[PDB]
Swiss-Prot record, chains A, B, C:
Species per Swiss-Prot/TrEMBL record: Influenza A virus (strain A/Aichi/2/1968 H3N2)
Chain's gene name: HA
Coiled-coil region list: none
Protein name: Hemagglutinin HA2 chain
């Protein structure tokens, strides 16, 4: 009779609410995983930027160090050359 | 009577189609977010490759510049040495 | 009569199980895509670490090479200077 139909209505309502809430919590799973992976890429981008910046900074420092040493060596070499020249006099 | 049962059938059909289309559009949300995050990682990979390539290129250029300068300095130092030696004669 | 109602029950059960299994397999799609993108970021992180490590290693090697050459050049220059000084005697 209609009683078995009503029991079917209740159990389809139950399973429908079940899949509803399950889907909702699994969407929560997916969205928190999006949040965490986006944070992962954000920190990775920050790491790449920091690495690039400090590598370029050290390249700059080494460049100016080489230039400084070259200048100093030329200058004192000329200085000792003139020193010896005067010592000859 | 069966009329209330029929109204229940219509409203469960309504809510079922509702959750159906909602799930579909939210899956669309998730898949476009996959597409955009994959593009993000793609462009990040391209950025890392470009950074590595230009850093290695500048390292190469600095290496050959140092070698060139060393060679030039040795050569002209020897040249001026021979110049002064001949000037002594 | 109740027969059309029963047919409606069967077809809503069918469509409900259909959306159930479809959602489940599409969640499988989403989770394997999470797995593969997490592996992508993992290998990208490993690549960034390897690049940074070998660049810093080559910077170290170039630094010690420059220091070695500077030391060697100072030393042998002083040596030949003393050599010529003694040759004058």
């Amino acid at each position: 009779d209609l009683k078995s139909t009503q029991a079917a209505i209740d159990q389809i309502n139950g399973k429908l609410n079940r899949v509803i809430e399950k889907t909702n919590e699994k969407f929560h799973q997916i969205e928190k995983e999006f949040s965490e992976v986006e944070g992962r890429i954000q920190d990775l981008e920050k790491y790449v930027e920091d690495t690039k910046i400090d590598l370029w900074s050290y390249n700059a420092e080494l460049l100016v160090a080489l230039e400084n040493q070259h200048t100093i060596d030329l200058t004192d070499s000329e200085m000792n050359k003139l020193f010896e020249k005067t010592r000859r006099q």
